[PDB]
Amino acid sequence: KGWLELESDPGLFTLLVEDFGVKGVQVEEIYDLQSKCQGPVYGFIFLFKWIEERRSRRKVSTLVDDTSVIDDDIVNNMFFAHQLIPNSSATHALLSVLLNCSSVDLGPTLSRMKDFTKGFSPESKGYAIGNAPELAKAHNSHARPEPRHLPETMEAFHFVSYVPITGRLFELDGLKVYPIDHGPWGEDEEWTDKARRVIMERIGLATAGEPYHDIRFNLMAVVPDRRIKYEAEACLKEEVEKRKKFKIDDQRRTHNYDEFICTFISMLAQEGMLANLVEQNISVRRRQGVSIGRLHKQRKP
């Protein structure tokens, strides 16, 4: 069970959902939370800094909260999964968004997975979700290669999914045992304003002050793909150029540069002129208690 770390990028998620087989969906990075977006049909994915210090200092939390779901029928109908895989939070949130909405042309593998898992229990459902070869391959294809060499405390971040399954905003978390129901919307808004308000209050309770207090959050909105909307042409040109540049970024991100850098430095050293420019482009100031040297030497008696 490798499941390497995944980077949270809009183009990365767009390419990932394209690899999933679904054609009419993508993600967008909203910038202003006080603005209004058009057609935010699908749910929101929110990256927040997950720290267990609060839970350790608030150990009395296993009790059922007021916003927590009481019955099991709606949980059985909707797609909610626990965190049984170490690094499936991104996939958990993405599948929570995709499988809890209609009018979507899901991929054949995703369609048969949803059909098989329709009407199930969240624990074994998530366990079956984790045991998928195509899902793991898709996750690892877009996964960064550099973190796999690190193990050769930690700032962890987690996704939460906001979705209007039955006209009410439900929050889905990988680590939370029970989803919390806190969407009373359904009067005049298109579910966007309530999501913005809940994000605002989450940020307020997160920091509640002027100091940064480790300000690391990222909100993304799942939206139908704009290519078909623009087809049915400056908008088409900008959409296709964004798609191409994002695809290039995804291709470039997954390649490790260790061998390239090593080869470049070795070629410069064997060429002879390296010792010139490496002597001039020095970042740290010299004669500051740092032992800088041993470039062209052996040091083996």
Partner 1 sequence: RSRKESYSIYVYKVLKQVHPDTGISSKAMGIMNSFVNDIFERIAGEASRLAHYNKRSTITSREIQTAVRLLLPGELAKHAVSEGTKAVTKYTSS
Partner 2 sequence: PHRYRPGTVALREIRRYQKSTELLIRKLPFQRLVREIAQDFKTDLRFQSSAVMALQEACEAYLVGLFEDTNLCAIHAKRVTIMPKDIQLARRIRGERA
Partner 3 sequence: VLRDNIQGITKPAIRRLARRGGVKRISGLIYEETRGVLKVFLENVIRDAVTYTEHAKRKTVTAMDVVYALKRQGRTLYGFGG
Q: Is 263:271 a contact under the CB 8 Å cutoff?
A: no
CB of 294 to DNA, least distance (A): 6
Shorter beta-carbon distance to DNA: residue 209 or 293: 293
Q: Is 153 in the site for partner 1 (CB under 8 A)?
A: no
Q: Are 142 and 252 in contact (CB under 8 A)?
A: no
Q: Which of residues 289, 293, 299, 300 is near partner 2 by CB under 8 A?
A: 289
State phi, psi for 243 to the nearest 5 degrees.
-60, -45
HSE-CB for 106 with a 13 A CA cutoff = 18
Binding partner 3 (rule: CB under 8 A), the pick from 58, 59, 285, 297 is 285
Query: Which amino acid is it at 173?
Result: D
Question: Whose Cβ is closer to DNA: residue 252's or residue 297's?
Answer: 297
Can residue 283 be called a binding residue for partner 3 (CB under 8 A)? no
297 binds, among DNA, partner 3, partner 2, none (CB under 5 to 8 A by kind): DNA
Contact indicator for 172, 96 with CB cutoff of 8 Å: yes
DSSP 40: -
Q: Across-strand partners of 60? A: none
Residue 263, SS3? helix
Kindly identify the residues of this chain, within the stretch 65-124, that bind partner 2 according to CB under 8 A.
none
Residue 210 in contact with partner 2, rule: CB under 8 A: yes
121-129, 248-256, 261-269, 284-292 -> range binding partner 3 (CB under 8 A) = 284-292
DSSP string, 102-133: SS----HHHHHHHHHHSS--HHHHHHHHHS-H
The contacts of residue 24 (CB under 8 Å, 6+ apart) are: 104, 105, 224, 225, 228
**Stretch 34-73: interaction string toward partner 1, x if CB under 8 A:** -------------------x---x-x--------------
Q: Which of 211, 272, 293, 301 is in the footprint of partner 2 by CB under 8 A?
A: 211
Q: Which residues bind DNA (CB under 7 A)?
A: 285-294, 297-298, 300
Q: 252 or 294, CB closer to DNA?
A: 294
Using CB atoms within 10 Å of the CB of residue 152, give its burial: 0 to 12 exposed, 13 to 18 middle, 19+ buried: exposed
Rg (the chain; Cα; Å): 24
State how far the Cα of 52 lies from the Cα of 153, in Å rounded to an integer: 10
Q: Which is nearer to partner 2, 273 or 290 (CB)?
A: 290
The binding track of 33-72 with respect to partner 3, each residue x by CB under 8 A or -, is: ----------------------------------------
- Per CB under 8 A, which region of 53-61, 171-179, 252-260, 285-293 contacts partner 3? 285-293
- For partner 2, give the closer residue by CB, 59 or 286: 286
Tell me which of partner 1, partner 3, partner 2, none is bound by residue 210, counting a contact when its beta carbon lies within the kind-specific cut-off of 5 to 8 angstroms.
Answer: partner 2
What distance in Å separates the CA atoms of residue 173 and residue 202, rounded to the nearest whole number? 14
- What would the two tokens of residue 253 be? 């991100």
Which chain residues interact with partner 1 by CB under 8 A? 53, 57, 59
Which chain residues interact with partner 2 by CB under 8 A? 210-211, 288-289
